[PDB]
């Protein structure tokens, strides 16, 4: 649950998509922090990074484009 | 800016002036001036053909460069001047070889700025280049209608033309009236938007303020007699007629366009 991003403290980067694809649903929606367990600080950086990879077409806005 | 004249007289109560301190205060450029005699509406036969014209102040025509067919040779703006023959201010322009010219002044042009024309020019206000090279969705002015003709559309104060789309050899423009019109793609178009955008907000305030621009009084057809105007007649403000022009044709609704030769270019009429 709470584990990832708290050990090996790092700032969520929008470039690496493998880490980002873990935190989205089957339709490109960001997964709530209640489910994954990411801390409230790193969810804000995480969400802001997913909204940045979508702009560059690295990630889908929705599964129906 | 617009300044409201204080009511020191009935005729100054309602005046609103548009004053531009950036304008030239001295005399115009002598070599680019001409003689401009008036007519009063009268054609060859000496008979008035446009009514409500006559009188007014004397004006001298300034030869404004519309073609803008001097490619290369960057030009520096010398000063801004007041053109009485037009609704927008003009700009004196000095080219790097020594030739001076008059141009329609875009809305963001001050003395000292640099312009130039041709396919190599940059996308900046005041620059003229063929609409092949101008990005779609841009706002241009002084558009042409035929390659090399000189420039007819978007010429008054504050008017502009959007380039909606480009389809091969033609460009669709959303004219200021709401029309969508196709023009050739080699027609030049000065990039930017014409200046003097406050020209709307001026109010004359009195009858002489319109008389001294050459606008003679307009008489209504109801005050006429049944022989001078189809409305005419009456004993105490009677109308009972469908409103018409003084020559019988029905004003107030009836369309009059009939060309059939330039209908290929009108994509969508006004609204």
């Amino acid at each position: 649950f709470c584990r990832f991003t708290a050990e090996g403290v790092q700032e969520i980067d929008y470039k690496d998509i493998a880490t980002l694809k873990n935190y989205i649903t089957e339709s490109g929606k960001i997964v709530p922090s209640r489910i994954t367990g990411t801390r409230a600080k790193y969810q804000r950086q995480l969400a802001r990074a997913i909204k940045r990879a979508r702009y560059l077409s690295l990630l889908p806005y929705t599964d129906r484009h | 800016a617009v300044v409201k004249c204080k009511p020191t007289s009935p005729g100054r109560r309602h005046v609103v002036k548009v004053v531009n301190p950036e304008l030239h205060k001295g005399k115009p450029f002598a070599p680019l001036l001409e003689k401009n005699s008036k007519s009063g509406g009268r054609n060859n036969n000496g008979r008035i053909t446009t009514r409500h014209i006559g009188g007014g102040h004397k004006q001298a025509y300034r030869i404004v460069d519309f073609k803008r067919n001097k490619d290369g040779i960057p030009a520096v703006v010398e000063r801004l001047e007041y053109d009485p023959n037009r609704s927008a201010n003009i700009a004196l322009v000095l080219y790097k070889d020594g030739e001076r010219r008059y141009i329609l002044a875009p809305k963001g042009l001050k003395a000292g700025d640099q312009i130039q024309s041709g396919v190599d020019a940059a996308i900046k206000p005041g620059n003229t280049l063929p609409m092949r090279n101008i990005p779609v969705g841009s706002t241009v002015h002084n558009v042409e209608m035929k390659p090399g003709k000189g420039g007819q559309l978007a010429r008054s104060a504050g008017t502009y033309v959007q380039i909606v789309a480009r389809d091969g050899a033609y460009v669709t423009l959303r004219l200021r009236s709401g029309e969508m019109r196709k023009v050739e793609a080699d027609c030049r178009a000065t990039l930017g938007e014409v200046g003097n955008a406050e020209h709307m907000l001026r109010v004359l305030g009195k009858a002489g303020a319109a008389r001294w621009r050459g606008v003679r009084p307009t008489v209504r057809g109801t005050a006429m007699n049944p022989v001078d105007h189809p409305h005419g007649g009456g004993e105490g403000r009677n109308f009972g007629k469908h409103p018409v022009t003084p020559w019988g044709v029905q004003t107030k609704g009836k369309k009059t366009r009939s060309n059939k030769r330039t209908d290929k270019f009108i994509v969508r009429r006004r609204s």
């Binding site: 702009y55 560059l56 077409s57 806005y61 484009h65 | -």
Partner: protein, 100 residues
Amino acid sequence: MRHYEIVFMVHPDQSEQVPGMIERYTAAITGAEGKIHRLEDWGRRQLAYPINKLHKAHYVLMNVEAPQEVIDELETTFRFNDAVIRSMVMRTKHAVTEAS
């Protein structure tokens, strides 16, 4: 002096046009005493959604340090270029050499 993270995508049919323009845009940074730190080129990628059709593009990453004004006349050449799509100029600092 300010640090930026320019990432721009070129047309899929200008893949031979990027390797010439990448140094031309870089030369403007170095001409004004601005340095460049990490210039990875991601090659040709696949878009998650179409961008005016074009299910493929060409990604570049510059990550330069330049005066605040120099990036201003680099943004416009991205804007008026018909072959550069979805330029994004962030404002990072420090780090380099990751993600590929």
